[PDB]
Amino acid sequence: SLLNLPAWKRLQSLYEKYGNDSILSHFEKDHQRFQRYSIEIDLHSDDNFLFLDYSKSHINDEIKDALVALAEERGVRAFAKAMFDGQRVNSTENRAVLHVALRNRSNRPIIVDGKDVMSDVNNVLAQMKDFTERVRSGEWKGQTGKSIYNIVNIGIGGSDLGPVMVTEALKPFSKRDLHCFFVSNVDGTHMAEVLKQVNLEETIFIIASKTFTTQETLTNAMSARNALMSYLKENGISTDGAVAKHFVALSTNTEKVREFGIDTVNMFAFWDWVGGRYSVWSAIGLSVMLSIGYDNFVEFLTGAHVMDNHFASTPTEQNLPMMLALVGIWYNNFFGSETQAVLPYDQYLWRLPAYLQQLDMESNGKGVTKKSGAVAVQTGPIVFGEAGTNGQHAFYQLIHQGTKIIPCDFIGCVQTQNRVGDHHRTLMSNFFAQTEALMVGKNAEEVRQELVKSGMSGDAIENMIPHKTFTGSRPSNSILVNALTPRALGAIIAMYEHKVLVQGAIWGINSYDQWGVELGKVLAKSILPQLKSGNIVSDHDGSTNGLINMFNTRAH
Amino acid sequence: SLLNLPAWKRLQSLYEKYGNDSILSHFEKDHQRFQRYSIEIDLHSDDNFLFLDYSKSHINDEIKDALVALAEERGVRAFAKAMFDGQRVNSTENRAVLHVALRNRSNRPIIVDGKDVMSDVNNVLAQMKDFTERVRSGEWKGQTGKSIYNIVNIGIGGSDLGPVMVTEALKPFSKRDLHCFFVSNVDGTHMAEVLKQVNLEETIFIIASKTFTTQETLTNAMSARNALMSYLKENGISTDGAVAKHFVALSTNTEKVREFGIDTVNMFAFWDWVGGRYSVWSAIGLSVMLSIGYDNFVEFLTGAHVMDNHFASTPTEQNLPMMLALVGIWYNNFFGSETQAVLPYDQYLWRLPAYLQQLDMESNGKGVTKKSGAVAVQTGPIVFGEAGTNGQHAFYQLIHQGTKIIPCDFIGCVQTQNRVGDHHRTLMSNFFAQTEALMVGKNAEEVRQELVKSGMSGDAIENMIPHKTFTGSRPSNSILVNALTPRALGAIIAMYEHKVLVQGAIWGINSYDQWGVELGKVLAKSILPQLKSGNIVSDHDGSTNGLINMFNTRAH
Numbered sequence A, B: 001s002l003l004n005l006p007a008w009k010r011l012q013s014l015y016e017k018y019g020n021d022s023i024l025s026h027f028e029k030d031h032q033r034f035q036r037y038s039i040e041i042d043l044h045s046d047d048n049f050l051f052l053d054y055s056k057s058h059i060n061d062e063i064k065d066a067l068v069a070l071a072e073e074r075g076v077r078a079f080a081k082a083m084f085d086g087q088r089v090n091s092t093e094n095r096a097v098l099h100v101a102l103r104n105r106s107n108r109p110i111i112v113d114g115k116d117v118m119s120d121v122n123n124v125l126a127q128m129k130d131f132t133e134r135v136r137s138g139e140w141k142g143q144t145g146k147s148i149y150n151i152v153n154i155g156i157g158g159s160d161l162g163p164v165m166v167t168e169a170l171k172p173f174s175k176r177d178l179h180c181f182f183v184s185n186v187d188g189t190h191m192a193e194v195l196k197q198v199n200l201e202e203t204i205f206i207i208a209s210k211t212f213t214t215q216e217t218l219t220n221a222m223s224a225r226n227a228l229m230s231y232l233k234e235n236g237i238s239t240d241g242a243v244a245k246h247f248v249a250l251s252t253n254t255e256k257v258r259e260f261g262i263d264t265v266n267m268f269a270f271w272d273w274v275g276g277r278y279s280v281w282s283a284i285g286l287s288v289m290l291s292i293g294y295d296n297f298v299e300f301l302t303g304a305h306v307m308d309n310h311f312a313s314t315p316t317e318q319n320l321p322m323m324l325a326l327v328g329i330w331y332n333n334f335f336g337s338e339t340q341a342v343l344p345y346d347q348y349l350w351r352l353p354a355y356l357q358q359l360d361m362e363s364n365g366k367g368v369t370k371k372s373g374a375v376a377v378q379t380g381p382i383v384f385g386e387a388g389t390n391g392q393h394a395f396y397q398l399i400h401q402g403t404k405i406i407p408c409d410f411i412g413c414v415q416t417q418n419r420v421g422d423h424h425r426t427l428m429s430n431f432f433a434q435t436e437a438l439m440v441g442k443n444a445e446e447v448r449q450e451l452v453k454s455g456m457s458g459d460a461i462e463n464m465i466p467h468k469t470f471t472g473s474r475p476s477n478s479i480l481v482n483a484l485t486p487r488a489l490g491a492i493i494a495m496y497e498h499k500v501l502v503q504g505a506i507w508g509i510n511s512y513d514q515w516g517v518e519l520g521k522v523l524a525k526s527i528l529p530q531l532k533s534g535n536i537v538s539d540h541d542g543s544t545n546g547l548i549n550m551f552n553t554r555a556h
């Protein structure tokens, strides 16, 4: 398919033709480049905006035009409309992909199975509203008459990463009183930690499971339920109704949540068309909404919804996530770059790169197309990154002087939470300079000039130059926001969510399944029973057998 | 140079010839493969060992032999001996590279500038011994007569990452009483956090600076010094000698540390031949030695020293870090793989991948050779990873079904800190299965078989198969340790340190300089003054100007 599309053949030819042209050459030609290769979205509240500047790239107009034609030829916009209308675009699982519904502020009806799913979203949202308002107000009391000061979220993967990244990002909008803890480990270690950290009389446990029997998570949950029960009993406090005051559920399995001791009025549902890596917007986000409250969660949802609207209605050339996706395709698929750095210059976004690893690589780390049959081109790249400043006395050495071309998203804010201090100006001088540095480089001649002005030996100058030269012509996107509020954050996540949709559409893959984990799960089930003192296995390959056999002969 | 070496030409030819041969084919041929492609190091204490199993790779004997011949031809072993003997192998800075001295337990004399540096190492070690013993015993008192229960380390980069990774890794060997905090940010945010978290009467601040005037760090340090002074004054406690009881220095600038109020008997020195990313072994490691105490730090140093000895004396074919480096070169330089995953199945090692990003990419992310002139081949790869279990409901999808070949180091322990519970067996069943999964894959035919046994529709089977197939033939190293003690940890870091030495030697680069950060620093200095309300700049390129101008017109 894709290897024989005119539009891709056209891009090959332009990569061959203009690929070696320095980034700086495209600025020397036209003096409005910054303007023509940047997009600003009005976030429609409080002077906030989301702005992408993709100017610092190996892309001219002929290329930019070829990239937009690829997206038309692949029918990206139409595939998106169908997703947005509840079509079962998750082909291999036969389901809708409706994270857009979870933040559909306008209540545009969306029909799955002869029902408007917005009924259900708005019902669970309004259920969360009433619940969180009652916890955050003080009115909800644990078994002894005390208000709640801790929330411990139980689960793993997309049931942990989202809530973690988002409550971190938004600490300045959060009730500082109630501490949030996130337990993801199979061993009870992190759970035991938090139980010897919290007063159980002032705490709620969130259990995140759709069937509400899932073995790992329901284990860590019983750790809590058992500690709660042991604690009441020793101190002469009755257990009657007690789990109902210290436990809530993110689930559909009404009677099994009720058997567990939870009041089903406190079972916050979500649906099969909410994928794990697209779930913070749903009831999975309950810990976020506890932490920052309802109005702020609605702002978060709204900033996403503003991004959905921008993405659905805006023609490709001016369409922010589309252009984001398309510069990523230029690098991933024609330059052959294997990686994507995400570098937020705001310490609150410190967990954003990890989140974007889940979202991007779990979605687009695929080898086959929907129609089935191997992909003919590179799919998703390896996402990495750390929060700005930090990475700078680390792996920036390599982005700058190494032999790998790596696309970098620099993300930053115009304003700072702390109005007074010089901290922020200094930080943003680095944010602009790094992308400037990557593009322009520093010449043999410029270095020579400097080293002469330092009065270097006439001799140890010619052999020193090359260590201090930078090539430049290394790409970077600069992404800015006026301020990192809930709503800006929601727009940033949604932007990446649709960047991912767009890349996977163009490649022909299903972005919304995850069959890649199955193999490891099945081979582990078959190994567990073989782990016993003195046992030798022979039924695997030699390495697996050796390793297993070393474990069996040396453990306890 | 390197492009015209017989040994490299030989490897190209073998990549072309055997590159497509499945990993599993090398097991079918010989039944002892596991044994012949694995190395065990005796760590000489407590049944502990460090073991590398590199069998699951696209390497046969002809290749393995070509790779060892590359290392001989490049004179890796001789370059290492010179480094170990205090030769100035850091060419561009004209200095020794002597992190091996810092853990030279045997006291093999090493001469830099007509002096045995071991005099100085052992003196600072014995200074740290006496100091930490006195803090950890209770005997050191803050200004009010109280023992110390907090340690706050101040600095960034290699002055933060090492201490952080290592105290995390070794929490089970640590005084649980004294909390450790690590401040790396330029904005005072994280510093203010820790000052409203600690009682100043029971705390020591570690300041990590060689000149002891370095502006950022000395700022955050004065935040602490100023808070200390303000606190005594309000509560009617004298300031006489008070900074001397609450502050210590990691530095050489004796009189400037003394001007700051610190007792120079408490100035813990280190040397210019200790690079930042190789510094935890030195006095930079003071917070580690506080946390776990002297005997444990010596065990840490010793495990490294055991690794140095193994690395210096063991012929290449049986030499663990050499073979590690060489399989990494096979993938990085012939397969063209841009990345390196490090995946520790032990939650205590959760910060190891970040550390290894600094170490690897800051060392080997270079574009020029020592003799000067551009490198003809790919140098360091992009390191990423997270701790086992976690990553598994994330980006494992991509390692398994994506279109990028990525070398994975799986690192694990035979034993667990908590003797009773099933947690650990379950974890290691995943550790073995993942590398098994990556190698063997799951066939069109095997999947068909399963889906038939599930009674799938006869029809939605042929189009479903390919989504559930795995290709296999994806490499993995399995690295095991009997137990993650201080000494095993030290052996693991040193192993990677020498893997890095070996790769950079083969490529011709200086692994021990870091000129790649300079450009950004200089362009930031020049931008800072341009950041002012209403100011327009025109002296940069358009993107930089635009971005700056947007900031200036929209900030406060």
Ligand SMILES: O=P(O)(O)OC[C@H]1O[C@](O)(CO)[C@@H](O)[C@@H]1O
Residues within 6 Å of the ligand: A155, A156, A157, A158, A159, A208, A209, A210, A211, A212, A213, A214, A217, A276, B393
């Ligand atoms: O919904 P179940 O049956 O409990 O399992 C699904 C859950 O497991 C996870 O994959 C891991 O906790 C979550 O993302 C998800 O909510």
Ligand SMILES: O=P(O)(O)OC[C@H]1O[C@](O)(CO)[C@@H](O)[C@@H]1O
Residues within 6 Å of the ligand: A393, B155, B156, B157, B158, B159, B208, B209, B210, B211, B212, B213, B214, B217, B276
């Ligand atoms: O030793 P100075 O002059 O204070 O600056 C060096 C220090 O700065 C850092 O790069 C950052 O804190 C450390 O690695 C190092 O110890």
